[PDB]
Design a protein around this nucleic acid. Structure first.
Ligand code: SAH
Ligand code: SAH
Lengths: 259, 258
RNA sequence: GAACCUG
């Protein structure tokens, strides 16, 4: 008994057909236009274009002062490099180290020459769960793989919260919490908020198919209710007549080097 | 963190032969074979089901979970249990069975039960290399157990990958050997999204297998239905031993068809 | 689950 609203959403999500699923996952969200950037990357251009939808996702938090990237940025699970290359352009940032898993069927870092590329080092073939924590001014983390099983998701997100903990001391952070509605995840987030502060936030660019929320450093409030609000919002988008995504323009990351 | 099915496997593996022999049949339903086994040794080719498989398929058919029609293709047919059962069904027009064969592997058995003349079983056929054809119903019972769940996992995924291109607008009943492992759950989800259907537990399955069948005529959350089986099998560890419920075997009759 | 041991 005692089934949470996120769990109720997950069951309805899974029991969706493929036509239904592709309608739902984008219904009423905001989305960045990528057609311009996608064609530039195939052409082989290394300037102006964001590497992925990730840049625009991070920017949303940064525009709202929820994260304030400074000095030494460490980016756990950097993938292609969207978050890293974004941070490189910001005035307060001095260096960026990105780490990613890589390997077959997983995303590999892309060499770029967008504004601030020369303070960026992305290394692949690194399992972040075995990377000794280092002193850094801002910690970014986007790790956490979806499962149709919320209890599988639960233990994956707890594992992230366990490895992410010893990286946080006196720093700005933005950490993906894959599944925040499961009871045991809520207990750890509570204990974590008590010790390092911050808030959980929904990103509008996140699809309806994920219950993704981000643990942000600059903010405060009730994580339990903010989680429940996401649940109701997503549940309501099942019955709500399909809406087209709100299309915004992509990030322009410019060109050139930095000091 | 570990899944409920994974917990079940670790317990299963840590049992004495005496416990394992008690557990594997505790509280299951079972078909009586003494009648049929003797007739087959005697050399009879009518009435008798070739294996316990005929009664296993019937359980789904009785419940409208699979509805075998027209051209039935049966991957990993073995002795012929599923093929010969279907042959006697009203809507079926032709049956094609394919199996591995060779030493130590089950060879097809020639029978003259009702509808035998619309059945063709070919042995010496590795199904992973059989080009997919158009058919009205697809049956698949391939999948070998292993004490290692990660080994079962990859075996189960390889089956799911080969079976997929056979599915279009047809009835199906596919054995899913290990449905509790995380990456199998991801695949089954993507498949149900495409081809619909649901995962079901057959009561004639032993407690030593987490076996489930992906069937065409159904719907539901596979995560919760897999988990119910895990709790069911976990409960049967502590429950006091129960005798198997014995049922009568299938009578498959005799004669030919149009 | 066996180069090999126990289960
Ligand atoms: N244990 C681990 N260690 C390092 N990387 C991991 C990991 N587990 C998953 N990952 C990687 O985490 C990456 C997170 S997705 C990356 C997005 C990215 N923020 C962007 O803008 O483009 C995935 O590509 C996955 O490859
Ligand atoms: N890759 C493969 N290709 C073809 N047959 C295979 C196979 N792997 C296993 N088999 C055969 O698949 C069969 C599955 S058990 C067969 C039971 C059958 N449904 C019955 O009612 O009697 C086994 O005979 C195995 O020999």
């Amino acid at each position: 008994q005692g089934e949470t609203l996120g769990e109720k959403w997950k069951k309805k999500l899974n029991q969706l057909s493929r036509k239904e699923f592709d309608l739902y996952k984008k219904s009423g969200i905001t989305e960045v236009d990528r057609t311009e950037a996608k064609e530039g990357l195939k052409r082989g251009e290394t300037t102006h274009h964001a590497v992925s939808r990730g840049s625009a996702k991070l920017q949303w938090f940064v525009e709202r002062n929820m994260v304030i990237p400074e000095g030494r940025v460490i980016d756990l699970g950097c993938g292609r490099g969207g978050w890293s290359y974004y941070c490189a352009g910001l005035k307060k940032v001095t260096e960026v180290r990105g780490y990613t898993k890589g390997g077959p069927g997983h995303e590999e870092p892309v060499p770029m020459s967008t504004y601030g590329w020369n303070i960026v080092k992305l290394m692949s073939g690194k399992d972040v769960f075995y990377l000794p924590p280092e002193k850094c001014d801002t910690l970014l983390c986007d790790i956490g793989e979806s499962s149709p099983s919320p209890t599988v998701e639960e233990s994956r997100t707890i594992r992230v919260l366990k490895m992410v903990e010893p990286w946080l001391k006196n720093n700005q952070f933005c950490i993906k919490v894959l599944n925040p509605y499961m009871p045991t995840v809520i207990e750890h987030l509570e204990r974590l908020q008590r010790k390092h502060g911050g808030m959980l936030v929904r990103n509008p660019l996140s699809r309806n198919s994920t219950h993704e929320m981000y643990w942000i450093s600059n903010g405060t409030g009730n994580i339990v209710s903010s989680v429940n609000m996401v649940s109701r919002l997503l549940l309501n988008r099942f019955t709500m007549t399909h809406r087209r995504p709100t299309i915004e323009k992509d990030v322009d990351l410019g060109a050139g080097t930095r000091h």
